[PDB]
Structures are given as structure tokens and as C-alpha cells.
Amino acid sequence: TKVALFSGGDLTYFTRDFDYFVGIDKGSSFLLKNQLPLDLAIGDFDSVSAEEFKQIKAKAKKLVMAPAEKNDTDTELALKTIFDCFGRVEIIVFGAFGGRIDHMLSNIFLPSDPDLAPFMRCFKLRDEQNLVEFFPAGQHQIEQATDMVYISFMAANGAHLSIQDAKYELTEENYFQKKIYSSNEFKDKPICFSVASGYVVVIQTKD
Amino acid sequence: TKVALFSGGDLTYFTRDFDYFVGIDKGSSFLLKNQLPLDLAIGDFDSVSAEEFKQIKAKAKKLVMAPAEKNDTDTELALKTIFDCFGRVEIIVFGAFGGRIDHMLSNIFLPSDPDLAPFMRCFKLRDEQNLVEFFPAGQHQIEQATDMVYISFMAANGAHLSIQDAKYELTEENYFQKKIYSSNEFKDKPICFSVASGYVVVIQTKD
Numbered sequence: 001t002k003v004a005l006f007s008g009g010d011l012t013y014f015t016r017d018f019d020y021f022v023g024i025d026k027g028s029s030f031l032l033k034n035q036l037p038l039d040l041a042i043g044d045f046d047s048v049s050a051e052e053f054k055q056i057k058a059k060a061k062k063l064v065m066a067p068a069e070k071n072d073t074d075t076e077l078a079l080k081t082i083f084d085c086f087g088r089v090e091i092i093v094f095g096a097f098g099g100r101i102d103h104m105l106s107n108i109f110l111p112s113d114p115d116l117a118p119f120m121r122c123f124k125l126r127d128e129q130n131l132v133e134f135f136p137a138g139q140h141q142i143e144q145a146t147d148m149v150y151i152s153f154m155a156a157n158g159a160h161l162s163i164q165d166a167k168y169e170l171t172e173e174n175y176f177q178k179k180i181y182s183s184n185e186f187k188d189k190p191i192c193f194s195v196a197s198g199y200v201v202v203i204q205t206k207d
Numbered sequence: 208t209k210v211a212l213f214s215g216g217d218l219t220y221f222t223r224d225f226d227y228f229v230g231i232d233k234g235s236s237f238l239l240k241n242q243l244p245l246d247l248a249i250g251d252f253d254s255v256s257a258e259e260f261k262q263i264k265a266k267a268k269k270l271v272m273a274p275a276e277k278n279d280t281d282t283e284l285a286l287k288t289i290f291d292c293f294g295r296v297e298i299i300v301f302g303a304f305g306g307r308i309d310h311m312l313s314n315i316f317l318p319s320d321p322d323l324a325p326f327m328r329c330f331k332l333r334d335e336q337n338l339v340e341f342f343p344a345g346q347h348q349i350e351q352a353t354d355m356v357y358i359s360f361m362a363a364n365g366a367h368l369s370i371q372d373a374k375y376e377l378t379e380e381n382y383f384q385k386k387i388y389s390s391n392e393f394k395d396k397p398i399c400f401s402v403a404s405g406y407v408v409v410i411q412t413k414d
């Protein structure tokens with residue numbers, strides 16, 4: 001019931017404890033190259049040699065060819081596909097960062113897509129020292145994840161945030177403008193945060 | 208009249224053609240270690256050894272000690288300081304990315320700070336394969352930068368965007384929701400874009 005997507009980012013970190021393995025473009029080649037299952041290879045594969053795509057084309061339990069010129073990114077397309085086949089499943093996206101900033105932002109703001117927003121609570125961005133979760137507009141609580149030390153909140157579409165029970169709080173009584181409030185920490189208690197509309201992007205990090 | 212800031216990110220790329228050289232935390236050590244001028248070392252330096260901070264403490268033409276617990280990031284503080292000393296000067300920030308996602312976002316959305324917004328057109332984020340510019344709300348035009356191939360637009364605080372004269376346009380007649388519209392390209396003509404409010408973040412990239 002646990003799916004794992006190996007994006008085209010830099011997979012210097014990844015886990016193997018997963019039911020289904022999805023590989024976007026280069027991720028497909030990475031998976032194989034690491035003695036790992038390739039249940040699904042998706043994307044336009046414009047980021048892999050014919051030599052590599054030859055091994056993927058004859059090893060992937062399933063392969064999806066996506067148009068070169070489109071609106072959704074291979075990772076976006078991959079997440080949309082899976083949510084259709086499995087429905088509300090738990091996803092972890094590896095290699096969602098690195099290299100290009102435009103692509104990273106695309107992953108950081110995946111929920112911004114109307115079709116993904118509803119499932120924004122089913123997938124996460126993860127790598128060596130970063131963990132990214134997405135919360136719909138409203139009231140929420142969060143407990144610190146293992147390994148991680150710092151935590152930050154950022155509302156896509158500038159809606160005022162509220163943060164309590166954290167080392168640094170953000171009340172309506174001391175609010176100071178900033179897109180992302182980083183370097184915050186827990187303190188033996190769940191952190192409370194909320195947002196009138198949109199959705200919040202929580203980023204737990206370490207090091 | 209050209210200032211350059213060497214942040215604590217990964218400086219695998221940088222230029223030397225600058226009047227003033229500013230170094231945030233680790234950047235200060237990097238600058239020296241590269242036979243480069245250190246006109247200003249700023250930050251809390253909690254990211255450098257006493258051994259390194261000993262060389263910085265006695266080489267920096269100027270050094271600023273910032274509190275450990277604060278609201279602004281060393282880079283934010285550094286940019287605010289310079290804009291005070293020089294006023295509207297041209298800045299290029301190196302090592303604004305890498306490692307932590309929370310810090311990257313802080314640099315990606317630097318204009319989100321009320322005190323920086325006014326000077327958002329005076330500084331840029333740059334590295335190996337990425338170039339980041341910031342434009343205030345309103346009408347604007349942009350010509351492709353050298354070396355870069357792709358270009359993307361993203362409005363902080365979700366305001367509808369408009370994009371014309373680019374390979375892919377975003378009109379009010381075909382609009383589709385998404386935080387960042389990436390992988391767009393120029394085509395022998397300036398790209399026109401605008402936003403009712405807030406500010407736009409343009410990211411030219413390559414590779």
C-alpha cells in the first residue's frame with residue numbers, strides 16, 4: 001500500500017521498503033541500476049539515452065509514453081496516474097529536488113494543481129536532509145519526525161499563518177510578513193498551525 | 208557598483224568581476240579560500256569553526272555579528288545591510304541554493320520581506336544552471352539571458368499571471384491553475400508578462 005516515485009532529480013537518498021515502485025524518466029534507469037523493481041516507467045524519457053531506454057522498454061512491468069509538449073510535468077503526470085489506479089494511496093517522492101530550480105518549485109508546489117490538491121495529504125517529498133508535507137486550508141497539528149531537527153511553514157498563495165507550541169510562534173498579535181518562516185523547532189509538544197485558505201507547505205529538515 | 212554575495216549554499220559556481228564582495232557565514236571562509244576579497248563578513252557564523260572564524264575575524268575589511276535567534280536570515284540581513292550602505296546597487300547572490308529546502312525557499316522568496324520588496328529589482332539569485340529575477344506587480348518585458356534556454360514564471364501569493372510572446376502562452380482565455388509555469392521558451396522576441404498584485408519570480412534555467 002506504499003508507493004515510491006523515483007523522480008529525475010538527484011537520488012543520493014532513497015528507501016527500499018515499498019510495495020509499488022514508480023520511475024519518472026531517469027528515475028526508471030536509476031531504479032534498475034540499483035537492483036530495484038520497476039513496476040512503472042513513466043514520462044517522455046527525453047532525459048535518457050536510447051541505450052538506457054532500451055533496458056527500460058524491456059524490463060518495466062508497465063511503461064507510459066507522455067507527449068513532449070504538455071502542461072503537466074512527468075512527476076505531476078506520474079502522481080496523477082497512480083492516484084487513479086490506486087486511489088488514495090501513500091506516496092513518497094525521491095529526487096524531487098536538485099539541479100533546476102524551476103523543477104524543484106514544481107514539486108514544492110505540487111498541490112497547486114487542481115487535480116492533485118485533493119490528494120495533497122497522500123504524497124511527500126523526501127531526500128537526504130529534507131522532508132516536505134502538504135496540508136489543506138484549515139486547522140492542523142504536527143508532531144516532529146525522526147531524524148529531522150528544524151521545521152518551517154509556508155503558505156502557497158500568501159494567506160496569513162498561525163503557529164503555536166513551537167519555539168518561535170506566529171500570532172495575529174505579533175505577525176511579521178514573510179513567505180516562508182524557517183528554522184523553527186518543536187519543544188516536547190505538537191505544533192499547531194492554521195490558514196484561512198489555500199494550503200500550507202511544511203518542510204522538516206536537518207543538518 | 209556591482210556587489211556579490213557568497214551565501215552559505217553550495218558555491219560550485221561564481222564570478223570574480225565585482226566591486227564589493229560580501230560573504231555570509233561559510234561564504235566568508237569560501238571567499239578567502241579562493242584568493243578572493245572579503246570586504247564584509249556577515250552572519251552569526253554558527254556554520255563555521257573557530258579555526259575558520261579566526262581567519263575571517265582577521266582578514267575581513269568589516270565584520271558584522273548577528274544574533275543567533277532572529278527573524279531575518281543571514282542572507283536577508285546581508286542584503287538589508289548593503290542596501291543601506293550603498294542604496295540601490297546591483298547585487299548577485301551565489302550559493303543561494305543547495306542542501307536545505309527551507310533556506311532555498313527563503314532566497315527564492317526574498318522579496319516577500321517588506322524591507323526587501325522595494326529593492327527586489329536590484330538583486331538576483333544565480334548559480335551553475337539557474338538564474339532568478341524578481342519583478343514587482345504590474346506590466347513587464349524580459350529578454351532571454353545568455354547561456355540560459357528555459358524560462359519560467361511564478362507569482363508569489365497566487366495572483367493570476369499573463370504570458371505572451373513565449374513558446375507557451377498563458378492568456379485569461381486559456382488559463383489553467385498552477386503555482387509555477389515552467390519549461391517555457393523564448394522565440395526571437397521579448398516575453399510579456401504581468402500580474403495584478405504581489406510580485407513575479409522569473410527563473411531562467413538551462414541543461
Ligand SMILES: Cc1ncc(C[n+]2csc(CCOP(=O)(O)OP(=O)(O)O)c2C)c(N)n1
Nearest residue numbers: 070071072073074375376377388389390391
Ligand atoms: C503556461 C505555460 N507555461 C509553460 C508550459 C510548458 N510546460 C510546463 S510543464 C512542461 C513539461 C516539460 O517538463 P518536464 O516534463 O519536467 O520535462 P523537462 O522540462 O525536464 O524537459 C511544459 C512543456 C505550458 N505549457 N504552460
Ligand SMILES: Cc1ncc(C[n+]2csc(CCOP(=O)(O)OP(=O)(O)O)c2C)c(N)n1
Nearest residue numbers: 168169170181182183184277278279280281
Ligand atoms: C514565525 C517564526 N518562524 C521562525 C523563526 C525562526 N527563524 C526564522 S529566520 C531564523 C534565523 C536562522 O536561520 P539562518 O540565519 O539561515 O541560520 P540557520 O538556520 O542556518 O542556523 C530563525 C531563527 C521566527 N523567528 N519566526
Ligand SMILES: [Mg+2]
Nearest residue numbers: 025044046074
Ligand atoms: Mg522529462
Ligand SMILES: [Mg+2]
Nearest residue numbers: 044045046068
Ligand atoms: Mg520533457
Ligand SMILES: [Mg+2]
Nearest residue numbers: 232251253281
Ligand atoms: Mg548562519
Ligand SMILES: [Mg+2]
Nearest residue numbers: 251252253275
Ligand atoms: Mg543561524
